Design a protein around this ligand. Structure first.
Ligand SMILES: O=S(=O)(O)C[C@H]1CNC[C@@H](O)[C@@H]1O
Ligand SMILES: O=S(=O)(O)C[C@H]1CNC[C@@H](O)[C@@H]1O
Lengths: 667, 667
């Protein structure tokens, strides 16, 4: 990167491509004054802004030092710029206290594409749209043309839209082979609707903007994860097979484990989210938010965990950073003063849907340490080797006080990372990194270090584009470009509402994609009695045993991808353009991915399909199940139920593993 | 109205209430730069704006002469303020050509209420919401919680919202007893969401803002209509009875007339909107847009008109300012170059839903006179005595050129008044003002002069709040506060879509309201074959005979109201606070109206009702059907089908008429 600058024009280049400019004709910064309106309803946020001032700044002074270039903008902003061959930082100082709106422009051209802004569930390429950065419920349906979405809006204010996500991040990657990060947890809105610039709206003057370039996307990801962090290797035991999501107490849950094993489905672990109890609401069968094992539903659980461990099976649980008001840990947290409070001193109670919970104040070090100790003592301490570490999106912005003294308009997006750090430190302090794994749906900048595994959050139980099976693929790709290289999904989705229920076909198509991911896990969903469950159908269990076997057979390859993610930040699920940078079509494809360097996966995301159109970049490919060879381009392969459109490179060093799969399970 | 002004502060008072202020702490004007996006689909407009600059102006010079005060605002705006005891005008000169966004603030307090912004169908009191000023299709359903609205959005982009209207106007009335008008036909957005100020956003620097006060709302309406215009009296023949909306050609239409008369329903006129032919689309039974009578459907129509005239019955038709591209008049207009054109020089063909029409360029004086002559020759010239003068909302903004050379962003809202003027001059030059009547659903500033009669446009055929019977009352109250004092509605509504079809009860509830309006007219609606028609049911025809007879019995009173409207601008349908200005509840009521000074009407707007709650202001009231006396407050009256909740003042000079009605048709 190179800086060019006079007394009234600043420029920054990446190669021969200008990416920053401030002149009178093309200002780089606008500042202004806004008054927001934020209305939360059960984790959904309706956010509007009333802007009374917005104006571009005048560059009134420039000072060049061998290390720093200083831009003075009247009495509003000072920008200190420092550059290397690969890194520019722009630190901002605010000289006018009135400003609470900050618009930053990046030079662009019509053909450029951008990726990221966190885990995006609808659009991988961000160009042409804008993306608010505000963690929240991602929406049920997420598509205003569907009945599920409309009913979700009408009854629950919960239909959402294309940009909602549990894990937004003020960071993007450009096809000019740089990434840009705005060091701020404020509300932001990344606007890619203009041909000649990207505009980044921030609801504070951000501390710094960071820009870093590389010669390849692989190296760009190495630089991204150097700055944000890298995940550990997953525990070796995850590759033993399926992690089965079952509920109902000792007899039912361990009964289904035995039934699962008896049908020759390989099991890595049993995940009982109700290990701490159940709570039934009008949404469905939920959990008792009090993070100690439930002695009536799962008596003697520590002893029982030792027993299944001796048979090669791990036990997985569930925690989240809230506590319901009738729980034992709530009573203790109240007595110790560890909840976020209102101005009058009452503990703030959040409505999660017919029950009310305190928000453990993770910005209070004593409360943070207390909750970390709850994980150590009552989850890790009874031998639980993994858990869902849920939520993080529900911090309200109305009359709530945090120990940090910062506005909830700033701490709201910070919360997922504070929650991630709490889990990470519990595991690290216990010496269990690499032995236990928790998985999170919410995140922010820093989840690259503090989250051991993402999952895609709640999908609807359907084949829709914006909230079904397909949206998992988009979420994997976007998250991976942010440096979160390990993700998975609920096999079969989660959300059943408004006559939308899971089918056998949906479960199996979901499973045949999951076997080409690091972590296979099922989920009964919110209404288990009226949604298909794999253990309800012998044919499904037979079919599932094959899919899980394929996962275990892939594991020597998958371990090298997880290792490569841990070593350099190359995600396990990669976009096609990560290894085919010259292929123009690879930049527009978001429903196929490279499973490592050596496999291409194009999951079937529609019902009643028997063949599937696949775009293959130019290379020597072999269809997994048939061995037929392909050299690149649009094709159509058979894709019956159980036969994922999956291809491997001919000269892959793992071709023997893939051939063993074909011989055993091909056509 | 008194001005206070020094070098650093301007103020304007109405009595002892400050209505305008400019100081550095409370600026009166912001200016800026925006880039709109106007997405048009079949008369529906999705409009968004991208504001890049907005900033308050600094008052840098004040010049007082004897009559004028000149406020200079840097190099941006000069405002010339001239006041009287009742009138203040602010003329704006634009000194910076870059400005295309103008925000004008009006001082307000929390208890103030505001009325107007044209004909509003959802909210009469505007306080607490914002109202875009852009004529368009008003929406089907207009309520995001209903199935009809949702489907209208999904299939037709046509659900609309609370603010959409055929007739917006940048004019409001305040409870400080002033009205304010912005002299512009640009897009505007009147924002009443803030306690301490109204803010009027205009997408140009407006020529002038006009403010005029008065001691009473009656006198305010006198001033409003002195400025905007007053309607003529309605022709005496309208009071002869019902205007029946029928279709199908000579045999069916005049057959239905005979049937109606045979059932002893008094008929003032037969309104055949298909006088010029039909066109069937997926929307339903529409019309052929070629404004000459259809010689195959209505052979020898001029002869038929003479025959029914000799029996005391008028004939009414239909025109609108567009021409379908397979018609005779389209061919002539195309030859003479009388259509609006695109940038590429071709005639712009607007899609109205499976057919395409030219827009007669009403800004071209030659085309204007031509279309006026079309009305004289082919409507008035064959003896038609009234007509629906429809549409006016569909001018596109994307790629169109007008003879005026003004932007379609300015002429779009202008079109309804140009079209009104076309009809007005045809009638006036024919010497028929007061003898023939046309009715319009679209309008703008000036419709007060150029439109002889409003109607509330298309309602859905239901009892919903935002698009059924009740929204007619809101439209009547709001239009009347703007000086359009004559209005009516389709008895039974118009729009049938998405499993919503007209019922008998709905038709009858609508008719029993309509008999307390100036003009009773039915309509077959868009899907006559699958919707209730009054002539389907003998009991309905017997009931309608009574309702129409009541309308004729009221005529001596109603005529004095229409004459009062023509002489002073007091609307026929008045808000309760127009005659009870001290009644606090009168300012919150929008589904009751005073029918002149001597009657209160509170229509049943819900199904399955046998009684109705009514608020009466403090006065001596007599329930029309029973004779029971009431003295003010909340009451409940019997309100069976046919017994509108209607009350008259005991001391009314017309009490003898009202007693005859009770004797003949009461309980
Ligand atoms: O119902 S609960 O809220 O207790 C648990 C759910 C929370 N969201 C993620 C889902 O996977 C959990 O089952
Ligand atoms: O269907 S048509 O468009 O020809 C006529 C309708 C237009 N809008 C107003 C309605 O009253 C008409 O029937």
């Amino acid at each position: 990167m190179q800086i060019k600058v006079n007394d009234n024009e600043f420029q920054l280049f990446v190669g021969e491509k200008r990416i920053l400019e401030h002149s009178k004709e093309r200002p780089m910064i606008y500042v202004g004054v806004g008054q927001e309106d934020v209305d939360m309803y059960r984790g959904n946020f309706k956010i509007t802004d009333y802007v009374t001032e917005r104006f571009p700044l005048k560059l009134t002074d420039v000072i060049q030092t061998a290390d720093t270039v200083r831009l003075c903008f009247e009495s509003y902003i000072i920008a200190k710029i420092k550059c290397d061959e690969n890194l520019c930082t722009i630190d901002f100082e605010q000289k006018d206290d009135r400003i609470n709106r900050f618009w930053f422009r990046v030079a662009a051209d019509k053909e450029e594409k951008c990726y990221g802004c966190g885990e995006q569930m609808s659009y991988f390429n961000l160009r042409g749209r804008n993306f608010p950065i505000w963690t929240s419920e991602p929406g049920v349906g997420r598509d205003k043309t569907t009945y599920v979405t409309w009913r979700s809006d009408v009854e629950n204010k919960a239909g959402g839209d294309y940009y909602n996500t549990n894990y937004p991040q003020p960071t993007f990657v450009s096809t000019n082979k740089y990434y840009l990060h705005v060091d701020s947890t404020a509300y932001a809105d990344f606007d890619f609707r203009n041909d000649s610039f990207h505009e980044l709206q921030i609801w504070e003057v951000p501390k710094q903007i960071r820009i870093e370039c590389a010669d390849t996307y692989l190296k760009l990801l190495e630089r991204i994860t150097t700055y944000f962090g890298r995940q550990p290797k997953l525990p070796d035991w995850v590759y033993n097979g399926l992690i089965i999501g079952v509920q109902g107490g000792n007899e039912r849950s361990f009964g289904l484990l035995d039934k699962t094993l008896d049908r020759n489905i390989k099991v890595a672990g049993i995940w009982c989210q109700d290990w701490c109890g159940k709570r039934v609401t009008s949404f469905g069968k939920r959990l008792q938010w009090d993070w100690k094992y439930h002695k009536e539903m799962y008596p003697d659980l520590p002893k029982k965990i030792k027993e299944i461990n001796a048979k090669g099976i791990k036990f997985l649980g569930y925690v989240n950073p809230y506590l319901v008001n009738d729980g034992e840990l709530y009573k203790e947290g109240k007595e110790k003063g560890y909840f976020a409070t209102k101005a009058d001193g009452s503990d703030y109670l959040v409505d999660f849907g017919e029950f009310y919970c305190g928000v453990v104040d993770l910005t209070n070090p004593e409360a943070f340490e207390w909750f970390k100790d709850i994980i150590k003592e009552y989850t890790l301490g009874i031998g639980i080797d993994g858990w869902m570490a849920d939520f993080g999106e529900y911090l309200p912005t109305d009359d709530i006080c945090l120990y940090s003294g910062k506005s909830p308009m700033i701490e709201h997006n910070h919360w997922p990372v504070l929650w991630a750090k709490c889990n990470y430190e519990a595991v690290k302090e216990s010496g269990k990194l690499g032995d236990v794994v928790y998985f999170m749906r919410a995140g922010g900048a820093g989840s690259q270090k503090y989250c051991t595994l993402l999952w895609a959050g709640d999908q609807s139980v359907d084949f829709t584009i914006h909230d079904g099976l397909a949206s998992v693929i988009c979420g994997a790709l976007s998250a991976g470009m942010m440096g979160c290289g390990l993700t998975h999904s609920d096999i079969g989705g989660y959300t059943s509402l408004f006559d939308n229920t899971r089918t056998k076909e949906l479960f199996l198509r979901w499973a045949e994609m999951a076997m080409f991911t690091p972590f296979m896990r099922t989920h009964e969903g919110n209404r288990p009695d009226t949604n298909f469950q794999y253990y309800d159908d012998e044919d499904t269990m037979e079919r599932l045993a094959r899919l899980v076997d394929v996962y275990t057979m892939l594991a020597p390859y998958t371990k090298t991808l997880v290792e490569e993610n841990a070593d350099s930040g190359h995600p396990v699920q990669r976009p096609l353009f990560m290894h085919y940078e010259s292929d123009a079509k690879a930049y527009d494809i978001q429903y196929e991915y490279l499973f490592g360097r050596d496999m291409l996966i194009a999951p079937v995301y529609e019902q009643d399909k028997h063949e599937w159109d696949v775009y293959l970049p130019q290379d020597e490919w072999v269809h997994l199940w048939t061995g037929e060879e392909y050299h690149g381009g649009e094709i159509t392969v058979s894709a019956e139920l159980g036969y994922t459109p999956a291809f491997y490179r001919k000269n892959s060093e793992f071709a023997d593993i893939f051939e063993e799969i074909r011989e055993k399970y091909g056509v």
